[PDB]
Symmetry: C2
């Protein structure tokens, strides 16, 4: 039905082996929720836990927190208007929205004592039996959201504004990015159908069109997210450094200019931990390369041996099995990257998130493109280097030409498989898991439905937006640097994106708990990843056009094609950046409107008379250069006399 | 000696043929200098003119103008501190400097009536007999400046600060850029002497070092000019759009959001005029290419025919004559570009200056690099295309191998000649001209020296900073993309730069009138030119390394060298941009310092009692979820009871 006015829920498991140290700590938890000004209510928690629900009781402290937060955006330049006048009648002018209300209640829960909160961060302090502070889903809103989004072909800006109003700015920026990407993916769908139907195979024109589309989509999304950050009032929140509660330290030094005590970590220890990425990256390169070389050698052996029924089908079963198995290897590698990033100490949330995103992007880049890269650039130009692997396979079974159109076919079997297993591990396998959890199964006899709902809500996983960003970034990479082999692939991705905008919505609706509303200026470092996946596309796809249309292949033609495609990409990037700086986006227009919205003769004679008095008190030619003519009129007659006697001789 | 307190001088020639329309207009001029609040003094002007001197009489109007100008920088974000409190005691906290005082007096002279001034802009209005409004040089300051700068090996920041204090921010930014360029040019001087002494000829390592140096110098100058703009308080003055008084218009429309009347020009007419640049550019390409092809064909003919005394010397006389003659052709082309930019109507000063700088950069790029480009990239790989020119020269005189080390020798004869003729047309030819002007030759008998000084001052030319910027940009281009042929050239440029910092200073001292102090955030579009001259260097210089070290030359080796050098340049650019974003420049440090410098139980019980009263006035389970437990303590005992009965079963 509906929530009972509960703003946040803290789980607070109480294990039996450390009960007393939990229990008195539980008392401290209520103390930590009383001095801030939150009303608490303790209830039973399943699986040996003790749920507490917190809401805002006094609206005066909440209005003080709203005014202080708006002041905090005012000093950081996020809010350019007047914050408040130390009295809260301005909340009727700009209403407080549910996302920022939940964000401020979470800040009141989790910030330390010396900025108003009392931090119940579940890692550092004695409150280690806390592990999850989460808001509650509105099931009526989720049902209407899913019913509205599944009944429309396209989404407008009001839906993204509703997502910003409910779930915060990060989820709204993801859904706006996915909507813009899905709308921009119609263009390579149309030209991919045109290239697949008319242009034959491995068209250079399609590669140039993909590079131009990548440039146009990237810069137009940068303009669109600038406009969205101005519209949502979160422009410049990336400059606000947020302290990380898990950040370990040993020195609390002073700031050299201001004097606030800053907790400092030695950067050489962080560099020494960061240097562990290189053996991890090279070990991942070696292991994944050995696995991919073994799989392609196996499928070459099957193409050599297996004669007649299913050569076209059973010639990519190692590739299909690799795409099927790579979620498990990917999950192991992302767990290793998460452990390495937790080991690699970071003081701010944004740097930690950027480093994690970089590690995840590199790992998923390898495990999602290394097979296609080996096929297009190692197997195609020289396939004689993997002969001992076929010797090993022939010796095992005892107990030549390279097809240039291979990277086309293996792309098709790469895409259709990866659109199935990603529909498996993200949609239907969690559906079967929650159905199995549902089929496996006093509370004051008028709130037992709500307590059962919050008890099954806390067992769900916290929603991660970086995984969905990663999936769409890898899809953009497929379009940018491998869609020239199979031009229909973007079309398939288009259909997938229409599912994704709904299905990920369902992933927030029923398959995950409500995320904490966080404010983001942009999608962040994924932008950089997109930029990289643009540039490498101009290196990659056109090279495929030279390597599969070919008579022997020459190095100078390949280098000329790569050079021309990359310089065409750079020229198109400069032209699009020049054009899009002239469109006059309404954010800067509103900023200009806001910036616009936010006898002497007697005086000169009195001044020269004062100068005459000061001269008569005592630079004599300094005074008498000006004191000979001091009025307005006598300048006119002496100028006329100088004109008249100028022509008198 | 010293000026007589004169802030500005207006020349105001009065020709005899339109005397009366001048003379009454002269009266209007005094009116235009009286309502603003300036004291005027009319004096005789030589060569049928009538000089007037204006100073500030009332300091109240000047302080009002200072307060209004500081308010204007406050709304535009240039000045972040408090502007004023509507009373002028804050001028003792931050003293008014002579450059900004002259800038504000020039603004009071030249701005129109509806922002405080009374515009005596010498083009648009009835005041067309005005042609020059100029400040007066301080000859004591100029003498001490030249004596101080000629007696020091290096200049520190106090000298550039003195130049900012006297002549404004544009001249100071030029001298800071020249000082930074001269200090950074020691590095290619050292590695050029090392490559010329030890590495032989056409070193790839020297080309990579030049690319790395170009990257490091460009990004470090960007950081340095950001720091200088923060230090001088002119950070963000490029956002302040300044209206151009020569801008023609036919519609005065309204702003669509604010309502100020904006004078609009149709952009299709501006585009139609801008399209005239392409025939001008292609005509310049064709004419300069024909002249250069004729000159190199002539010198190939002299190398073929002239046998024994001076083949090494008389084999570059067409090139020497081309460098000697190119100032005249360059001046004709810059006059044509100035006429085209005056025809091409612009509404703002910055866009007009950027378009003029782009046209001048393209023309000077052609006339300063096209001979070296034709030698390095047209003559070297295939020199059989210019045989009919030698047939013409042999037919005229009647009445084969290509040296790969040619671009070295012609570079030397290009540099040593261009360091002489630019020392001719900029230093000693104006010296002989002013000596000839001096040798060719009542005023109230105590100010005749000052009147003769201001009479010989007004005949001088207004100082142009864009020409000196252009000369240093072309010198940077020589180092960036042609110093691999002759590595000693940067060394010569180093010596020239030590002259230039003094000689251009002398060009402002005795050879030009005092410029109007204008505030600039940066050196402007020349930065973009430097960036282009960096990137093309990675294309050019390494290509020379492939084209002159070579056995026939292959296309794939040249393309691989160009690709590796350009991608090394891009990688070095990314690395330097990453490193220089971590140095913590003191401008952002000062901005952070300035940003830093600029019981509840009873309340919750009262709120829940008010909720109980509102419930009793009449959502019953909504209230009774919280109303069953409202205090602090009973939550603790019921939580302890839930813990105790949780383990009781
Ligand atoms: C762009 C997006 C979609 C394009 C849809 C095109 C649908 C029309 C398909 C028309 C068609 O099938 O004929 C082909 C095109 O003939 C042509 O080359 C003539 C150019 C047709 C112009 C279509 C653009 C020849 O078939 P092919 O010879 O290859 O056997
Ligand atoms: C492919 C090879 C990498 C597979 C790594 C899978 C194992 C990942 C893992 O859990 O190891 C953690 C170390 O962190 C890491 O891995 C990072 C180690 C990087 C060293 C490179 C691996 C060789 C131990 O964490 P702890 O048990 O302390 O809790
Ligand atoms: C990434 C590393 C990939 C390592 C894959 C295993 C490498 C297999 C191996 O033994 O090394 C040689 C590489 O030749 C190969 O197989 C071809 C692998 C090509 C990988 C090169 C990518 C760069 C074989 O040489 P051969 O046994 O004949 O003595
Ligand atoms: C191949 C089929 C991969 C099956 C992948 C799978 O769902 O089972 C995983 C075990 O398999 C695995 O270790 C996966 C190993 C993948 C090896 C790569 C396959 C190439 C075969 C040529 C663990 O399943 P989980 O723990 O998620 O429950
Ligand atoms: C296989 C090769 C993969 C290359 C990966 C390069 C792109 C990495 C993705 C970029 C990223 O997500 O993190 C950026 C790291 O800065 C970087 O990129 C530096 C390069 C790191 C790659 C090593 C932060 O971006 P920001 O917006 O915070 O600034
Ligand atoms: C940007 C990075 C640029 C990489 C391309 C440069 C690779 C080296 C080019 C020279 C390769 C080479 O000399 O051999 C050629 C065949 O091998 C090749 O086609 C090399 C194909 C490798 C594919 C590399 C594409 C870059 C994709 C990322 C023909 O032999 P050749 O004419 O000399 O007789
Ligand atoms: C960098 C800036 C300036 C370098 C100044 C170097 C002055 C020392 C000059 C010493 C010298 O003339 O001997 C040359 C260097 O020998 C060598 O290759 C040995 C390396 C010398 C290391 C110098 C660096 C050999 O002469 P080459 O054989 O060419 O007849
Ligand atoms: C090399 C060929 C260009 C040489 C131009 C030298 C003549 C430059 C010149 O004064 O011509 C002005 C036209 O503006 C221009 O030139 C721009 C004309 C551009 C057309 C291209 C030239 C062919 C006339 O200005 P107006 O007499 O009206 O005062
Ligand atoms: C820039 C345009 C430069 C035009 C220079 C004058 C062009 C001289 C000319 O008549 O054109 C042909 C070009 O061959 C040449 O001379 C060589 C000029 C090379 C210029 C190519 C640069 C691109 C000669 O051909 P041919 O008389 O044998 O019939
Ligand atoms: C060649 C010597 C160039 C002499 C340049 C010179 O100072 O005299 C100019 C006349 O020469 C000129 O038209 C210059 C024509 C330059 C033609 C290019 C020379 C190549 C000769 C192979 C006009 O001098 P100005 O008006 O400044 O007094
Ligand atoms: C022979 C080829 C010469 C290429 C010249 C390219 C560099 C031109 C120099 C760049 C310049 O000074 O003006 C910029 C024009 O924007 C441009 O560059 C656009 C390219 C214009 C060149 C056509 C304005 O820069 P902004 O800082 O105002 O932004
Ligand atoms: C960035 C712009 C890149 C330009 C380089 C591409 C030029 C075309 C390369 C192909 C030129 C070509 O096929 O002929 C070669 C000789 O000519 C050449 O060395 C061309 C030399 C032209 C110099 C261009 C340098 C760019 C400088 C700006 C050898 O003949 P091949 O091996 O085929 O038998
Ligand atoms: Ca999916
Ligand atoms: Ca997803
Ligand atoms: Ca000079
Ligand atoms: Ca100069």
């Amino acid at each position: 039905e509906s929530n009972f006015g509960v703003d946040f829920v803290i789980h607070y498991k109480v294990p039996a082996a450390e009960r007393d140290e939990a229990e008195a700590g539980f008392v401290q938890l209520i103390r930590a929720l009383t001095t801030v000004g939150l009303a608490t209510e303790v209830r039973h928690g399943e699986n040996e836990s003790l749920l507490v629900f917190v809401k805002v009781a006094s609206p005066d402290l909440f209005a003080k927190q709203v005014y202080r937060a708006r002041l905090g955006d005012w000093l950081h330049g996020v809010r350019v208007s007047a914050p408040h006048n130390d009295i809260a009648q301005a909340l009727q002018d700009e209403p407080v929205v549910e996302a920022e209300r939940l964000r401020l209640i979470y800040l009141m829960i989790t910030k330390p004592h010396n900025e108003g909160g009392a931090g119940v961060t579940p890692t550092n302090a004695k409150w280690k039996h806390v592990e999850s502070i989460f808001p509650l889903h509105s099931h009526s809103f989720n049902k209407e959201w899913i019913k509205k989004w599944s009944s429309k072909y396209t989404l407008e800006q009001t839906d993204i504004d509703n997502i910003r109003d409910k779930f915060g700015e990060s989820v709204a920026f993801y859904f706006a990015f996915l909507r813009s990407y899905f709308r921009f993916l119609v263009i390579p769908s149309a030209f991919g159908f045109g290239a697949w139907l008319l242009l034959g195979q491995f068209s250079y024109l399609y590669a140039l069109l993909c590079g131009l589309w990548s440039v146009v989509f990237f810069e137009y999304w940068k303009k669109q997210e600038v406009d969205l950050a101005v519209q949502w009032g979160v422009r410049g929140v990336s400059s606000i450094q947020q302290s990380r509660p898990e950040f370990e330290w040993e020195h609390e030094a002073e700031d050299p200019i201001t004097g606030e005590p800053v907790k400092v970590y030695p950067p050489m220890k962080r560099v020494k931990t960061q240097l562990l990425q290189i053996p991890f990256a090279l070990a991942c390169v070696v292991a994944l390369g050995a696995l991919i070389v073994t799989c392609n050698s196996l499928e070459v052996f099957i193409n050599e041996v297996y004669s007649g029924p299913g050569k076209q089908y059973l010639g990519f079963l190692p590739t299909i099995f690799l795409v099927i198995g790579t979620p498990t290897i990917s999950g192991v590698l992302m767990g290793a990257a998460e452990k390495l990033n937790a080991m690699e100490n970071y003081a701010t949330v944004d740097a930690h998130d950027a480093a994690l995103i970089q590690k995840q992007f590199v790992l998923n880049f390898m495990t999602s493109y290394m097979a296609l890269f080996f096929t297009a650039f190692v197997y195609i130009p020289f396939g004689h280097i993997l002969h001992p692997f076929l010797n090993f396979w022939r010796a095992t079974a005892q107990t030549f030409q390279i097809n240039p159109a291979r990277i086309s076919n293996q792309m098709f079997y790469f895409t259709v498989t990866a659109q199935i297993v990603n529909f498996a591990t993200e949609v239907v396998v969690p559906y079967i898991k929650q159905q199995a959890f549902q089929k496996a199964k006093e509370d004051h006899e008028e709130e037992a439905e709500f307590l059962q709902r919050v008890r099954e809500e806390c067992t769900l996983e916290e929603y991660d937006v970086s995984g969905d960003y990663r999936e769409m970034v890898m899809q953009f990479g497929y379009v940018a640097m491998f869609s020239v082999a199979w031009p229909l692939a973007a079309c398939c991705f288009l259909v997938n994106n229409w599912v994704e905008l709904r299905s990920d919505a369902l992933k927030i609706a029923i398959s995950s708990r409500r995320p904490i509303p966080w404010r983001t200026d942009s999608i962040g470092p994924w932008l950089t990843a997109l930029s990289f996946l643009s540039w490498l596309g101009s290196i990659t796809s056109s090279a495929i056009v030279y390597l599969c249309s070919n008579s022997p292949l020459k190095a100078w033609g390949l280098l000329l094609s790569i050079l021309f495609a990359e310089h065409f990409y750079l020229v198109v990037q400069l032209a699009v950046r020049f054009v899009l700086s002239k469109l006059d986006s309404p954010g800067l227009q509103k900023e200009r409107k806001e910036r616009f919205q936010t006898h002497s003769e007697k005086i000169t004679r009195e001044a020269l008379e004062e100068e005459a008095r000061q001269a008569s008190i005592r630079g004599t030619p300094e005074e008498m250069f000006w004191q000979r003519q001091r009025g307005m009129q006598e300048t006119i007659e002496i100028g006329r006399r100088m004109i008249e006697q100028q022509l008198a001789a």
